[PDB]
Symmetry: C2
């Protein structure tokens, strides 16, 4: 009752598709690293088992050529990366938001709050202001701009929107996450093998939501947000580091992220499952929940599926997003929320959440931090 | 008049090294090897002389700067060393302010449920919010909101954010911290960048922290209640303050009269919170019947709002006290003013924490031009 409710979802990607099978050829070509046959072979193997069929990128041969800094491994390049990201992140978000807003069907003057998440560049005024402007929202929309957040921020913006919507009568929150790999793209290097991983998995994309409490008769609820939590996992210090430098944004992976999440995932779920027990007086198996999971990559999905003994269909909405768009950082989990709803229509499900009642939304980022939200289907 | 997010503690911290504003231009034009720029230095001395600042505190000094010549140039590449400094020092300064807040609060730190961190000084992953969680040893399941690259309005933003966290979650106690270090903005003066001289005159280092929660217990000590909160972009202000993060650091551009724009629109901003006060109290205070917790952007903003609203000269005094002793510490500043409001209430034997008055306005200003407005109630 009065719970923050997802009322619309919209998504956007750059038009240009990069087929994953051939991406090594393109990548090692533009970075003039063709002479590194053993490294290229390693990269092709990573791409081949990534579970990704294609990614969408704003970045193309023309732009990368016009800006050779970005085609180096660690040369100066932040300024052109910023020029690109500061401009394109809000633009891609407007596209997603206009689709959310259409779905919602209400006038945009009714939007009272905006939460913007990204890991791709920073500016003042922020991407949140640029989007307010691009959409012609009211000037007194209350904004929260979440910069440099990482892959957990799709979940983070839903958590933030939940308290805005629930504590403010009438509030209608526009949530937008938008990412463009302009700030992380770099030449592959034998001295940065963990860097191959991001190069294989990260793609561009934006996703938006409308969230509000007390949906009106003309609004259409998709999911309810019942419980929200965040935590730093044990023995995970330094797992993912991301340093914004003159060379742009560099990642360092120093621990087994899939394994750590796997190791702790039952613990993470304990309280949201207590809450369900409080309301439904029952205790579902993990496989009796639907899953809206950040597609960090195939290994996290496989190992959580194995650990929690999930029917193979449960990760399917997540893997669908991974297959078609790769890892778009914070926007990704909201793409999965959309896909979850889309398949409920196509596969004639009894609810928006794979025909089940309760669902788990999960995002993962530097910390190692996990965001957990308990959803209810409609 | 029950359940409103309440300030339960305030703590502040600044780097120990003090720089007298009178002689700041000597130091500044010297470490940047710009002594030949004598007319420029004259302009800067004048700007510093009318700034209303007696001293600032800085982490940066001659030794650090000389060890990092990139930072003493006008637009030379230096983001890497600036980040090295900011990513380290921003959460450390925040920790000191936060310990003071937690001390005043009086409760175990395990009862902290949320952390909101604001800064304009560097970015890292994990963020300064994570760093501060670790430095304080809070529970790993404290709920964090990390606000990077925000600018001068973020002291008020984190208070708007904390209000909803506290009010929608029963027994929530929110640690709020803003922390700023000028390592990312410091650079050589230049006749090509005259608006850079404003920032060089005004900006200082500092951090501040609150504890905020709804429904204070009898062992907690309320300072201020947050009754209303708004944020708005001002009309005809497009491009007034730009801030770009580049390879040479954070660069600021001032393309419009920020004090004029704020003054031109201030009464309109206040209409809605004053309607709230009319609804609750059935009468309309004059602006000078409120207490004022204002971001000390610089002397001109304070002077012009004071005049526009016909404020008694004493209303802006807590704000001016912070400008005098610390300068413009970006996001943190308005929370120093909140502290100073309470402090002068004790020492001047006021009837309430808010200069003896019931209702108060909190104002933060930043790029957009954005204004954060909060209505406070004193205790």
């Amino acid at each position: 009752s009065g719970k923050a409710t997802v009322l619309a979802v919209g998504t956007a990607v750059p038009p240009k598709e990069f087929d994953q099978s051939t991406y090594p050829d393109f990548y090692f070509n533009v970075t003039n690293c063709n002479d590194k046959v053993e490294l290229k072979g390693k990269f092709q193997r990573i791409c081949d088992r990534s579970g990704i069929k294609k990614r969408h990128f704003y970045l193309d041969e023309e732009i990368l050529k016009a800006n050779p800094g970005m085609c180096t491994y660690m040369g100066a390049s932040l300024d052109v990366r910023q020029n690109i990201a500061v401009r394109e992140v809000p633009k891609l978000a407007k596209e997603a938001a206009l689709k959310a807003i259409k779905e919602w069907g209400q006038p945009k003057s009714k939007i009272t709050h905006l939460v913007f998440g990204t890991t791709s560049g920073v500016d003042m005024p922020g991407a949140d202001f640029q989007l307010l402007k691009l959409l012609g929202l009211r000037p007194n929309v209350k904004r929260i701009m979440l910069y440099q957040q990482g892959c957990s921020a799709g979940a983070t913006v839903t958590r933030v929107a939940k308290d805005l919507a629930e504590n403010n009568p009438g509030a209608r929150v526009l949530v937008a996450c938008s990412e463009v790999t302009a700030v992380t793209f770099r030449a592959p290097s034998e001295t940065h093998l963990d860097g191959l991983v991001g190069a294989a998995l990260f793609g561009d994309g934006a996703a938006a939501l409308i969230i509000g409490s007390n949906p009106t008769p003309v609004e259409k609820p998709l999911f309810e947000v019942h419980w929200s939590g965040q935590c730093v996992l044990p023995d995970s210090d330094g797992a993912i580091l991301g340093h914004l430098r003159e060379a742009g944004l560099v990642f360092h992976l120093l621990k087994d992220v899939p394994g750590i999440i796997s190791k702790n995932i039952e613990k993470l779920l304990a309280e949201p499952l207590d809450y369900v027990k409080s309301v439904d007086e029952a205790s579902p198996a993990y496989t009796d929940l639907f899953w809206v999971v950040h597609p960090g990559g195939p290994a996290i999905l496989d190992q959580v599926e194995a650990k929690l003994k999930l029917d193979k269909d449960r990760m399917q909405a997540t893997r669908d997003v991974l297959a078609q768009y790769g890892n778009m950082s914070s926007a990704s989990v909201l793409f999965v929320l959309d896909q979850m709803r889309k398949r409920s229509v196509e596969l004639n499900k009894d609810t928006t959440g794979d025909g089940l009642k309760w669902g788990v939304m999960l995002g993962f980022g530097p910390g190692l931090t996990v965001e957990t939200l308990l959803l209810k289907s409609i």
